[PDB]
C-alpha cells in the first residue's frame, strides 16, 4: 500500500491521473519524482522549468554543480540528484526532444532508467514541449516500465484522450 490516490489503474504496474505533478509532489511526497531533463539540466519550461521554479531554483543550482563535475547526460540518460522540498529524490531523465531531431527509439532507452527505482511519480517521457506524441509516450512506458509508476498528465483534455485510447 502506498499514498497515491484518484489513479486509474491501466496495467498490473501502470497507473494515470490528470494532476499537476508540482502539487502531486508536494501533497505525496513521494520517494522518487521524475524530471523531463535535458542533457544540460538547464530547467527552463514545461515540466523542468515547473518542478525547478517550486524548489525556488535550488534544483538549478544543484544541477550546475553536478554538470560543472560531470559533464552532460546522454539522451536517454539518467541522474538522481536531490528531490528538494518535493520528494526524497528527483530522477533527472532525458527523453528525446523531436523539436532537436532527436531519435525517438530513444524514448525506450529513456524509460529503462524508471525500472532502477520501484515506485515513481512522472510525467510521460518526451512530451509536451519535448514534442513527441504522448500516445506513444504511453505505450514505450506500459511495454518498457515494470516497477510501479504513477503518471500525472496535466492536461485534462490530453489525459481523456489518453484513457480513452488506451490498448
Ligand atoms: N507535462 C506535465 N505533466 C505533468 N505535470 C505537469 N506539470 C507541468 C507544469 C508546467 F508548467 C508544464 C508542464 C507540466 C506537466
Known amino acids: 500500500v502506498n499514498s497515491f490516490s484518484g489513479y ?16 502531486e509532489a508536494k501533497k505525496v511526497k513521494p520517494t522518487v519524482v521524475v524530471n523531463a531533463a535535458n542533457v544540460y539540466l538547464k530547467h527552463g519550461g514545461g515540466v523542468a ?14 544541477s550546475d554543480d553536478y554538470i ?13 540528484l536531490s528531490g528538494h522540498n518535493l520528494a526524497k529524490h528527483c ?5 528525446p526532444n523531436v523539436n532537436k531531431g ?7 532507452s529513456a524509460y529503462e532508467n524508471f525500472n532502477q527505482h520501484e515506485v515513481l511519480l512522472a510525467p510521460l517521457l518526451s ?13 514505450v ?3 518498457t516500465v515494470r516497477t510501479n509508476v504513477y503518471l500525472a498528465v496535466f492536461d485534462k483534455n490530453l489525459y481523456d484522450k489518453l484513457v480513452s485510447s488506451f490498448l
Open 8 to 23: 486509474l489503474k491501466l496495467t498490473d504496474n501502470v497507473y494515470i491521473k490528470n494532476a499537476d505533478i508540482v502539487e
Open 102 to 108: 532527436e531519435d525517438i527509439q530513444l524514448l525506450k
Open 49 to 62: 522549468g515547473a518542478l525547478n521554479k517550486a524548489t525556488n531554483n535550488a534544483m538549478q543550482v544543484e
Open 68 to 80: 560543472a563535475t560531470n559533464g552532460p547526460l546522454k539522451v536517454g540518460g539518467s541522474c538522481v
Open 141 to 143: 512506458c506500459v511495454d
Open 91 to 95: 530522477l533527472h531523465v532525458v527523453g
Open 127 to 139: 512530451a509536451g514541449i519535448f514534442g513527441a506524441d504522448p500516445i506513444h509516450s504511453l505505450r
